[PDB]
Amino acid sequence: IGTGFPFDPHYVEVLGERMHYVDVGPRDGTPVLFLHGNPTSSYVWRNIIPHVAPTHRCIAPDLIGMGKSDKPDLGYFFDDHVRFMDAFIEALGLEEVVLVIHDWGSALGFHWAKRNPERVKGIAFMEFIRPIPTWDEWPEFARETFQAFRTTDVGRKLIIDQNVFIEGTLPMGVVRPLTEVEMDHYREPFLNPVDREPLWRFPNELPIAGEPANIVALVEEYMDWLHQSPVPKLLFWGTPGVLIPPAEAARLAKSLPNCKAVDIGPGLNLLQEDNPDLIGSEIARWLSTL
Ligand SMILES: *CCCCCCOCCOCCNC(=O)CN(C)S(=O)(=O)c1ccc(NC)c2nonc12
Ligand SMILES: [Cl-]
């Protein structure tokens, strides 16, 4: 599994702020938009893009306040990421797209797809945001931690001051051992604790036990849309998983229209780090069928 990031920087102005994105592959077709989540960047797609790039354009932006994008003084609520990602897509003049989404990127992708259904020709997704009705439906071993993350006192000491989402939560979301080189790439954007606001607000935005109300309703809405949509779907899952257990993955493969499920083997949250070659090859294969 490659540790390098051999991609030239591309930048575009979005609502007054510069956002960074990877941009490779030919301009003569339908682009593929890769959306990462918390606490990652376009780096998380480094070993998946080379499988798709030869046949399709690959665009992988860093969310505002993350990766190599600018760091404006914001609360970094989901609404902020929505405004910026909406404007990013328009700034690149993209008409029709295929989405490849993960974690909070999936919340952005599905929410955008719901509002622009005619512009989405396919969605590949993995370990995605869905409504968690109660704390019982959150992984048992991470309940205390994420309950602690969702506080203004303990949560901010952990995530902001001590950087545990990078130093702990990130590597614990990968089955195989993340190397020090890979950890350093993920560390780069958040060396200053003042820049870690996005890392704390994200887990506080998760739709768990009806809070926050707005995110729960927003996510419920795009899941209803996904169940009602005939758009091609590609669901990657692993065992034991984190947000999407093997049992739920199989249920979704049946209930969602036009959905193909692919088992990646052992995995937790960052499935891209456990089996990038299968994920990449299956996206390339799937794209040719569309
Ligand atoms: C996509 C958004 C959701 C991401 C889900 C990520 O789940 C991955 C698994 O979660 C691991 C939860 N545990 C931890 O983050 C850290 N543990 C609580 S820890 O290892 O016991 C721990 C405890 C305390 C401290 N510092 C005071 C730690 N620093 O690093 N790990 C620590
Ligand atoms: Cl999160």
State whether the beta carbon of 37 lies less than 6 angstroms from ligand 1.
yes
Look at ligand 1, atom 19, and give the residue with the nearest C-alpha: 168
Q: What is the dihedral of CA 277, 278, 279, 282, to 10 degrees?
A: 120
Look at ligand 1, atom 1, and give the residue with the nearest C-alpha: 103
Contact 285, 188 (CB under 8 A): no
The two structure tokens encoding residue 250: 């199989």
Q: 3-state SS string over the chain?
A: CCCCCCCCCEEEEECCEEEEEEEECCCCCCCEEEECCCCCCHHHHCCCHHHHCCCCCEEEECCCCCCCCCCCCCCCCHHHHHHHHHHHHHHCCCCCEEEEEEEHHHHHHHHHHHHCHHHEEEEEEEEECCCECCHHHCCHHHHHHHHHHCCCCHHHHHHHHCCHHHHHHHHHCCCCCCCHHHHHHHHHHHCCHHHCHHHHHHHHHCCECCECHHHHHHHHHHHHHHHHCCCCEEEEEEEECCCCCHHHHHHHHHHCCCEEEEEEEEECCCHHHHCHHHHHHHHHHHHHHC
CA of 203 to the centre of ligand 2 (A): 4
Residues with CB under 5 A from ligand 2 (ion): 38, 202-203
Q: State how far the Cα of 286 lies from the Cα of 53, in Å rounded to an integer.
A: 14
Peptide bond into 245 cis (omega under 30): no
130: left (phi over 0), alpha (psi -120 to 50) or beta: beta
The two structure tokens encoding residue 245: 């257990």
CA 90 from chain center: how many Å? Answer: 20
CA of 248 to the centre of ligand 1 (A): 23
Atom from ligand 1 closest to the CA of residue 148 = 18
State whether the beta carbon of 103 lies less than 6 angstroms from ligand 1.
yes
Class of CATH domain 1-290: alpha beta
Contact 203, 93 (CB under 8 A): no
Residue with tokens 């990031």: 5
Method for this entry = X-ray
State whether the beta carbon of 108 lies less than 6 angstroms from ligand 1.
no
State whether the beta carbon of 145 lies less than 6 angstroms from ligand 1.
yes
Q: State how far the Cα of 61 lies from the Cα of 90, in Å rounded to an integer.
A: 13
Contact 111, 218 (CB under 8 A): yes
Where are the chain's structural domains? Answer: 1-290
Q: State how far the Cα of 130 lies from the Cα of 175, in Å rounded to an integer.
A: 22
φ/ψ of 206, rounded to 5, equals -55, 135
Candidate from 66, 164, 170 with most ligand 1 atoms within 8 A of CB, to mutate: 164
CB atoms within 10 A of CB 113: 21
Ligand that comes closest to the CA of residue 145:
1
Report the candidate in 255, 272, 253 with the shortest Cα–Cα distance to residue 264: 272
Resolution, in Å, please? Answer: 2.2
Candidate from 108, 172, 215 with most ligand 1 atoms within 8 A of CB, to mutate: 172
Label residue 69 exposed, middle or buried (CB < 10 Å: 0-12, 13-18, 19+).
buried
Peptide bond into 39 cis (omega under 30): yes
- Amino acid present at 212: P
State whether the beta carbon of 169 lies less than 6 angstroms from ligand 1.
yes
